[PDB]
Description:
With 100 residues, the chain is mainly β. The chain has strands spanning 4-8, 14-18, 23-32, 36-41, 44-45, 54-58, 62-67, 76-84, 87-98. This is Titin.
Amino acid sequence: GPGIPPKIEALPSDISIDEGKVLTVACAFTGEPTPEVTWSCGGRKIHSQEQGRFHIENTDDLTTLIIMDVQKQDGGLYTLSLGNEFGSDSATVNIHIRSI
């Protein structure tokens, strides 16, 4: 086909979750060819780690950020960026971790 610039369908502005739980943030998108997905926090790319607490699952129209056993230190602004040959898009979600 002709190609389609990437577009984050929607990302929440804010999400609150209890400390100690597993956070799951799914976000739908469009783009052709499939956009490269980058999640970042503090200006730094988050890497999906088999043995860590942070995991990322990407498909052709969805990306899901997973944070296991969330801690207060995990709170903050997470940026999702999408890039392909026809353009880019980004959005930020503020993750709030609730005490106790």
